[PDB]
CSV table of C-alpha atoms and ligand atoms in Angstrom, one decimal:
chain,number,residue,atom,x,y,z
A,1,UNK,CA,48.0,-92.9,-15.6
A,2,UNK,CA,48.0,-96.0,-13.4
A,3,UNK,CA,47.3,-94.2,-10.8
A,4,UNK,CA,44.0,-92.3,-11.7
A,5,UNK,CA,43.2,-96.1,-13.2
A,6,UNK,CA,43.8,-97.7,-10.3
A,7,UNK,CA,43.8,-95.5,-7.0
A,8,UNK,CA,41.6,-92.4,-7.7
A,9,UNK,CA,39.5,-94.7,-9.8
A,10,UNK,CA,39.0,-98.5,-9.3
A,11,UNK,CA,40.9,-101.6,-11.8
A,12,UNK,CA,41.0,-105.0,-12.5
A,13,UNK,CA,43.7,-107.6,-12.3
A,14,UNK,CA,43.4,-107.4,-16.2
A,15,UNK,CA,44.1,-103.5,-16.5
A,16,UNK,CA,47.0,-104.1,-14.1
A,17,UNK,CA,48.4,-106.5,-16.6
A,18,UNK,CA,48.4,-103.2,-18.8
A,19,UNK,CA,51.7,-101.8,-16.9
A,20,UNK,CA,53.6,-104.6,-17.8
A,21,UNK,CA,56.7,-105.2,-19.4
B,1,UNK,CA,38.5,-111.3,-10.7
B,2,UNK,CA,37.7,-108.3,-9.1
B,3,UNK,CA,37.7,-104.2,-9.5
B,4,UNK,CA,39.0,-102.3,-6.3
B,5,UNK,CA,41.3,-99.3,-5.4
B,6,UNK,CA,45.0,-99.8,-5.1
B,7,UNK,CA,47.0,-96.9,-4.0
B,8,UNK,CA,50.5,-96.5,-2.9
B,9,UNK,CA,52.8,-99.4,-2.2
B,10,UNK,CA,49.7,-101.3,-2.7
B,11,UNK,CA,49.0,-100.9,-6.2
B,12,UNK,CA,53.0,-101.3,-6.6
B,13,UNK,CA,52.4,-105.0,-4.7
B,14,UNK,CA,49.3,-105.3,-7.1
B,15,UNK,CA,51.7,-105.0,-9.9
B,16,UNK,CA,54.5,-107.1,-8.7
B,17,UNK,CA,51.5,-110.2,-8.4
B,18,UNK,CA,50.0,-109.8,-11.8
B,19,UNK,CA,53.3,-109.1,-13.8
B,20,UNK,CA,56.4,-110.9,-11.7
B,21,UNK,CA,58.8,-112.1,-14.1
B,22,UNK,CA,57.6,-109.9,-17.0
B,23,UNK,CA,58.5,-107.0,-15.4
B,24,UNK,CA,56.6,-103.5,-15.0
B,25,UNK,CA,56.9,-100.3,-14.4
B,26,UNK,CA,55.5,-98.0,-11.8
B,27,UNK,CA,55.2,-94.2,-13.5
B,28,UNK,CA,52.6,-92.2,-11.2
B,29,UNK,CA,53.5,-89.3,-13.2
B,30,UNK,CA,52.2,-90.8,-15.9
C,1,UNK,CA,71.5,-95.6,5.3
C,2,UNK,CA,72.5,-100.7,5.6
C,3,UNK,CA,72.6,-102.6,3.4
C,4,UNK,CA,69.8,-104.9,2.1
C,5,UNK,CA,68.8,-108.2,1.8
C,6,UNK,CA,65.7,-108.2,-0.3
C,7,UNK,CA,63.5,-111.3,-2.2
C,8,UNK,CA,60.2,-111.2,-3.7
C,9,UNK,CA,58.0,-108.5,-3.0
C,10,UNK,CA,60.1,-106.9,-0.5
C,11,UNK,CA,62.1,-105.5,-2.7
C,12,UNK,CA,59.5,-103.5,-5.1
C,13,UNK,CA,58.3,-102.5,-1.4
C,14,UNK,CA,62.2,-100.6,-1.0
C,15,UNK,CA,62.0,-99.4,-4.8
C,16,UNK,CA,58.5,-97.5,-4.1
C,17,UNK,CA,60.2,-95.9,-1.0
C,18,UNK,CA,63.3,-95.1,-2.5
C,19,UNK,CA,61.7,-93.8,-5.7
C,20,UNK,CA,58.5,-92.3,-4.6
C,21,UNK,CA,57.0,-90.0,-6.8
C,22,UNK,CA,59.9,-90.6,-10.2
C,23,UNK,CA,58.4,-94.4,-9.7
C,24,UNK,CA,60.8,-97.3,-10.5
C,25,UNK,CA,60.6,-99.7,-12.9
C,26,UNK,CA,61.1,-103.4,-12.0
C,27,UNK,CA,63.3,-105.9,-14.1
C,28,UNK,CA,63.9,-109.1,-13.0
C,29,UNK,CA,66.2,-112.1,-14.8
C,30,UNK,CA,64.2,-114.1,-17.0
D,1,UNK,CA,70.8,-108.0,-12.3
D,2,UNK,CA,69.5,-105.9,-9.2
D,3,UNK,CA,66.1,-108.6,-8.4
D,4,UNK,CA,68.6,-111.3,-8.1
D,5,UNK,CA,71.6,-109.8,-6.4
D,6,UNK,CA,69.4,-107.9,-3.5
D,7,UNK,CA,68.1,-111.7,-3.0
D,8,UNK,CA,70.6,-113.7,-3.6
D,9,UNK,CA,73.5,-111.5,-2.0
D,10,UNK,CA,72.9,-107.8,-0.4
D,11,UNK,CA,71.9,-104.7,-2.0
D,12,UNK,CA,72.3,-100.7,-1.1
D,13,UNK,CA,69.6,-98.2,-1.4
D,14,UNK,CA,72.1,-96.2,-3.8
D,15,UNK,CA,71.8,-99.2,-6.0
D,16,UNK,CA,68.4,-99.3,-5.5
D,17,UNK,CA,68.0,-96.0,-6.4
D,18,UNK,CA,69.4,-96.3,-10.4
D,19,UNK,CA,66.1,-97.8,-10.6
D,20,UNK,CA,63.7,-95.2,-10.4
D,21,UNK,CA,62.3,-93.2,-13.2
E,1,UNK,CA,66.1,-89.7,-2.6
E,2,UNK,CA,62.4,-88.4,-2.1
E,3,UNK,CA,59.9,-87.1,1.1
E,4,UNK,CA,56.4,-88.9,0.8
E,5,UNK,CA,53.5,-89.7,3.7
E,6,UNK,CA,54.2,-92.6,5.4
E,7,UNK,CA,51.7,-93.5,8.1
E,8,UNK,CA,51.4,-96.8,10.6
E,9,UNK,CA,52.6,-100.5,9.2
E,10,UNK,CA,54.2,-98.5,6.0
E,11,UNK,CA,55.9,-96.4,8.9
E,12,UNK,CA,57.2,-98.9,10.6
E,13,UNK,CA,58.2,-100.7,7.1
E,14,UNK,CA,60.7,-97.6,6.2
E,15,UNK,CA,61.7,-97.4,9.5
E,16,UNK,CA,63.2,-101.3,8.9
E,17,UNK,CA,64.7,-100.8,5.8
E,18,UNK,CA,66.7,-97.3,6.7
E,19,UNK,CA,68.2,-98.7,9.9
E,20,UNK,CA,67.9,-102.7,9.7
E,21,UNK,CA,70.9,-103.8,12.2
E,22,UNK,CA,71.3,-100.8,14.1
E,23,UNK,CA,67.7,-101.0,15.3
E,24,UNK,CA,65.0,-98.4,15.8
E,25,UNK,CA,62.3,-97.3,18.3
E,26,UNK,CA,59.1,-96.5,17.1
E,27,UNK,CA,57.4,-94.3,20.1
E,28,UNK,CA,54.1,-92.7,18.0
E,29,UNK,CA,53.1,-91.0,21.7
E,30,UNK,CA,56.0,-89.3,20.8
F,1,UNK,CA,57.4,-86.9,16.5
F,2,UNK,CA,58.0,-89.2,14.0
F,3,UNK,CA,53.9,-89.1,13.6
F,4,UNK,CA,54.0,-85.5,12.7
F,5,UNK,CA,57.0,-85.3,11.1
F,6,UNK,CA,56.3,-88.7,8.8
F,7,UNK,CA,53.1,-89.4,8.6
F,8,UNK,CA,51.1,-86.2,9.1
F,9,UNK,CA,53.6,-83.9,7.4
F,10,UNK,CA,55.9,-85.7,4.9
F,11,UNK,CA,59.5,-86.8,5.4
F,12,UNK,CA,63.0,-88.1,3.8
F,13,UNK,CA,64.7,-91.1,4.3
F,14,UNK,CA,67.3,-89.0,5.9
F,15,UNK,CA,64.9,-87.9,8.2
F,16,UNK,CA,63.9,-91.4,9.2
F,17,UNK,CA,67.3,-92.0,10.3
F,18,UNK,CA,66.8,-90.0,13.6
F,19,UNK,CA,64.5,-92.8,14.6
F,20,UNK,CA,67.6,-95.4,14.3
F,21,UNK,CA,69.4,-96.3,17.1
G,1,UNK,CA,46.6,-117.1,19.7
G,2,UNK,CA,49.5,-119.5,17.8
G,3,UNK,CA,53.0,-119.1,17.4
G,4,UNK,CA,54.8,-117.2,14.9
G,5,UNK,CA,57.4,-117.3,12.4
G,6,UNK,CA,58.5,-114.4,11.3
G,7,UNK,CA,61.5,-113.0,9.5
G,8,UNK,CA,63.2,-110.0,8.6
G,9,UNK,CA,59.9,-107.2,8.1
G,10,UNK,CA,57.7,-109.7,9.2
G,11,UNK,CA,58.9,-109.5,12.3
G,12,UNK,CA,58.2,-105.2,12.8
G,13,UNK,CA,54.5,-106.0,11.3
G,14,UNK,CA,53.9,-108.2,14.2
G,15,UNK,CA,55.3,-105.6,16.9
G,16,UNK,CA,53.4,-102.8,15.4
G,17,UNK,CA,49.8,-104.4,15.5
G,18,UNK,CA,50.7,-106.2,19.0
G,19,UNK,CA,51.9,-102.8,20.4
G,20,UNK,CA,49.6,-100.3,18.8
G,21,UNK,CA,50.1,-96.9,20.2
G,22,UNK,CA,52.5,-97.5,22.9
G,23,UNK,CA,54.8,-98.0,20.2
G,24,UNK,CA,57.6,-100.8,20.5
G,25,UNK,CA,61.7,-100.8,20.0
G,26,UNK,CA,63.2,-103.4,17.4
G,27,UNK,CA,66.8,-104.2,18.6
G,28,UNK,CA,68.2,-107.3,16.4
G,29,UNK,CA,71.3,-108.9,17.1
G,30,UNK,CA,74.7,-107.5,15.8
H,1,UNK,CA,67.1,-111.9,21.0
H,2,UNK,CA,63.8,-111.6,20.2
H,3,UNK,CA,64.6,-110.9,16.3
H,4,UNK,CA,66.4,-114.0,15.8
H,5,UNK,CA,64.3,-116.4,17.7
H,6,UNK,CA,61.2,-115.5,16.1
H,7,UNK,CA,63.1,-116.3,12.8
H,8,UNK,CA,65.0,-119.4,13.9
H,9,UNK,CA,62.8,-121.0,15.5
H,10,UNK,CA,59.3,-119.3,16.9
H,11,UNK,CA,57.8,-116.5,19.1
H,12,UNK,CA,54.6,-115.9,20.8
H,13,UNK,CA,52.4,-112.5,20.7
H,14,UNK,CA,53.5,-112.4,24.3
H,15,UNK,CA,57.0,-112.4,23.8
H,16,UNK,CA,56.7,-109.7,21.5
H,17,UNK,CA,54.3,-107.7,23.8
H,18,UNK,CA,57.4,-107.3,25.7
H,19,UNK,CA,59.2,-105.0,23.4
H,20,UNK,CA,56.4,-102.6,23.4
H,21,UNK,CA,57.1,-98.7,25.3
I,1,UNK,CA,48.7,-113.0,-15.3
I,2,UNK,CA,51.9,-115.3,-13.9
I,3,UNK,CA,52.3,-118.1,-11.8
I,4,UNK,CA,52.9,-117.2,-8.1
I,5,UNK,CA,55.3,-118.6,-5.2
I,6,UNK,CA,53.8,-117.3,-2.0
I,7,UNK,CA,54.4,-118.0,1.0
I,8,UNK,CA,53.1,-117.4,4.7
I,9,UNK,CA,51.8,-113.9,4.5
I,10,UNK,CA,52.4,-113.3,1.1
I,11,UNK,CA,49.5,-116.1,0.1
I,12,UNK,CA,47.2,-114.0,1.9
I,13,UNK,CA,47.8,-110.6,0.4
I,14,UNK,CA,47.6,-112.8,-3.0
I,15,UNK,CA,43.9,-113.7,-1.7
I,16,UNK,CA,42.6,-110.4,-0.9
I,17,UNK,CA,43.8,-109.1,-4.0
I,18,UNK,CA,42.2,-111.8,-6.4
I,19,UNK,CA,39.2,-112.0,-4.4
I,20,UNK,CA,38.2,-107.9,-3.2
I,21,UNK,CA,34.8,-107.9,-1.8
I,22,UNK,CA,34.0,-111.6,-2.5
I,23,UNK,CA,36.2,-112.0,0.7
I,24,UNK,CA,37.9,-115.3,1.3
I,25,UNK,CA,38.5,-118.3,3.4
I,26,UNK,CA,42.2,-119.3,4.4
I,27,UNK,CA,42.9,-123.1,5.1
I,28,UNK,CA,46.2,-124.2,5.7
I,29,UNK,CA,47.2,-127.3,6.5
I,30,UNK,CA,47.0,-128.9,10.2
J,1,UNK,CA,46.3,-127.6,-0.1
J,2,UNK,CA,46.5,-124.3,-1.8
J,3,UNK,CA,48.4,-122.7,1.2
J,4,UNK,CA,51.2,-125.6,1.0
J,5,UNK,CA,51.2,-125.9,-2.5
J,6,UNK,CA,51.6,-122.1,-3.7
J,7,UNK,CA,55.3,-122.0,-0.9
J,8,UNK,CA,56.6,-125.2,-1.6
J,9,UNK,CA,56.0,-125.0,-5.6
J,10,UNK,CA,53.4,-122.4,-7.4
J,11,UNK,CA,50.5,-121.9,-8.1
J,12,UNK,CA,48.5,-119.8,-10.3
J,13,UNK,CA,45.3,-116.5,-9.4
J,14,UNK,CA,43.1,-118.7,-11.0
J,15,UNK,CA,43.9,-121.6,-8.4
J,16,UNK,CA,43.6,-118.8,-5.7
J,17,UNK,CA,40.4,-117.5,-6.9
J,18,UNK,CA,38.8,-120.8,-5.6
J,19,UNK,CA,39.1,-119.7,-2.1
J,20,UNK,CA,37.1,-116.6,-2.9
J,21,UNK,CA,33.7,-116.6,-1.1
K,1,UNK,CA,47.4,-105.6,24.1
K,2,UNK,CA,45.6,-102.8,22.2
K,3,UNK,CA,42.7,-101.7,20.0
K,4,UNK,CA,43.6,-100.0,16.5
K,5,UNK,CA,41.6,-99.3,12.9
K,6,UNK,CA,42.8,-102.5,10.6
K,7,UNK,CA,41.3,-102.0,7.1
K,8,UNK,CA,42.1,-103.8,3.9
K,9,UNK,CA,45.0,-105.8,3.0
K,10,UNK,CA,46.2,-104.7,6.7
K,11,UNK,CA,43.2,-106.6,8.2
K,12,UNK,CA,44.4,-110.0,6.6
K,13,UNK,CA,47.3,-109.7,7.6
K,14,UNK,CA,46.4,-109.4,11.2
K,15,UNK,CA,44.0,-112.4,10.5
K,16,UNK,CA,47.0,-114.1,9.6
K,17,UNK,CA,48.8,-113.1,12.7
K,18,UNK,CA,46.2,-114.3,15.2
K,19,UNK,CA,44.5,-117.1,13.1
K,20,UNK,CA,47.8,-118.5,11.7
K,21,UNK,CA,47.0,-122.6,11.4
K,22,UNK,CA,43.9,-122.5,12.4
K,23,UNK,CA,43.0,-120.5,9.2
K,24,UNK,CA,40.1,-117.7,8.9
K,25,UNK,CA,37.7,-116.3,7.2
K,26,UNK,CA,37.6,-112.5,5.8
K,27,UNK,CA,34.0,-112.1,4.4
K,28,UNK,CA,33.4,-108.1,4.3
K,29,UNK,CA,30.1,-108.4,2.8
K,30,UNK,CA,29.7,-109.9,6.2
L,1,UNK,CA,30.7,-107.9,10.2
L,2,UNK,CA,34.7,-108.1,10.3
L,3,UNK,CA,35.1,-104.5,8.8
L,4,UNK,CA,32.5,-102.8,10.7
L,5,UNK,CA,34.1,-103.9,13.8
L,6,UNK,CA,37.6,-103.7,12.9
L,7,UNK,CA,38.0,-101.0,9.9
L,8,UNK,CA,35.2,-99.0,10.6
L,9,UNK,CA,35.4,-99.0,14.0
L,10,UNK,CA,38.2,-100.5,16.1
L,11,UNK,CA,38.8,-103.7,17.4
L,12,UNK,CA,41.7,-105.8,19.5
L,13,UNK,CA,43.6,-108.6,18.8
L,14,UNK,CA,41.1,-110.9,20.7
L,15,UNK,CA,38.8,-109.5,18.5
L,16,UNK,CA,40.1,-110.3,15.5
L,17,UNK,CA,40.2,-114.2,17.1
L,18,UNK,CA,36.4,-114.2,16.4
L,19,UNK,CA,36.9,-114.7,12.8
L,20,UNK,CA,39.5,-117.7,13.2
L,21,UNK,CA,38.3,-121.7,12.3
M,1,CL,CL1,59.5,-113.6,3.1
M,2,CL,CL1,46.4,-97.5,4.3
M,3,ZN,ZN1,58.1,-111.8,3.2
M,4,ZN,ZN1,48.4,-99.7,3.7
């Protein structure tokens, strides 16, 4: 989830935009 | 842009930048 | 626990401390 | 809805709480 | 609610929104 | 205090409420 | 240093990176 | 006090030193 | 991505998010 | 400038990735 | 005052504190 | 640089005035 994405791993601005409404 | 680690109520402030007004949800569960 | 006055970024700040681990999802007007 | 009234007016962490998952 | 780590500024940050008005003392030293 | 109980350890919002005054 | 504004959680931010360790006591009005 | 001038109007870093322990 | 209103420290948050390891230069005005 | 402009109307990232080094 | 480990997102903001008008530079690559 | 001396190490408030225009 967003956080393996984004913590554990590393994202972009753009694969933020992924969690969204 | 760039590619860096957000964690905790950073990555939730991350969200709130990128999507405002649209919304999002924050599901670390998954 | 006050009451709040919350704007902006502040409040998904409370809604990651109130929520932790469940997460939160944010909704704003328009 | 709960963005504008914790702004606007004031807010309880009970309300806030309706809010997570 | 939940129990989560909360360590320096975020600390402090929880600390303000659970008491706002009635204050707080943050002594780490203990 | 609030260190070990809070940061090092983990705690609730009820617990933060001891630090009030 | 300059002079500050600061507001609501602002305001505990600035105390806890001016008072480090020793800790600090945040007592607003009313 | 403190909390209300620095939002009202402004505060110094050594005003606020003064609420340190 | 969404259009931002951000103000004192909330522009510079917005900075180091958008720019990461690029770093940044903050400029206000007088 | 971009610090007045993005607090007393908005602004966009792509405005704010100018001030990236 | 003191001496404490600012990293991140929580080094701007203390940039922010001290700098305030006079502005800053954050440039981590160095 | 700034993170070396502030992140990686430690640094004061005076410090961090080195890296002010
Ligand atoms: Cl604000
Ligand atoms: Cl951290
Ligand atoms: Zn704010
Ligand atoms: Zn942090």
């Amino acid at each position: 989830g967003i956080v393996e994405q984004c913590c554990t791993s590393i994202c972009s601005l753009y694969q933020l935009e992924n969690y969204c409404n | 842009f760039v590619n860096q680690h957000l964690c905790g109520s950073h990555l939730v402030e991350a969200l709130y930048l990128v999507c405002g007004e649209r919304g999002f949800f924050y599901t670390p569960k998954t």
